Design a protein around this ligand. Structure first.
Ligand SMILES: *[C@@H]1O[C@H](CO)[C@@H](O[C@@H]2O[C@H](CO)[C@@H](O)[C@H](O)[C@H]2NC(C)=O)[C@H](O)[C@H]1NC(C)=O
Lengths: 50, 49
């Protein structure tokens, strides 16, 4: 156990999968989605309500 | 702070901004530190509770 690595493959795989899912969830906040800007404050404060 | 807007808790920090860099960043592209344009002192940002 002490010298050789990659024995604990399964637990590390679980952790990596969870981290990747959470990261790609967070990263989806900068997409335009067809609007004119990703950030909501400027678009709310720059145009009319309609 | 100079165009970029947000909310949170301001704190004093000890980062090492390069002489031309304005605001720091994180792994997920979330603003972390800023440099106030009046005394050039690095400044840290924390989310609310
Ligand atoms: C902008 O103006 C401010 C204030 O007029 C200047 O602030 C000085 O900051 C230094 C250290 O950061 C202090 O030793 C001085 O006493 C401050 N001046 C005053 C009048 O309080 C600042 O240097 C100016 N320039 C910039 C680039 O911010």
């Amino acid at each position: 156990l002490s010298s050789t690595a990659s024995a604990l493959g399964k637990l590390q795989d679980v952790v990596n999968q969870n981290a990747q899912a959470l990261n790609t969830l967070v990263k989806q906040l900068s997409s335009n989605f067809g609007a004119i800007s990703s950030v909501l404050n400027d678009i709310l404060a720059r145009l009319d309500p309609p | 702070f100079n165009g970029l807007t947000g909310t949170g808790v301001l704190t004093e920090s000890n980062k090492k901004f390069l002489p031309f860099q304005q605001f720091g960043r994180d792994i997920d592209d979330t603003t972390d530190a800023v440099r106030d344009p009046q005394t050039l002192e690095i400044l840290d940002i924390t989310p609310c509770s």
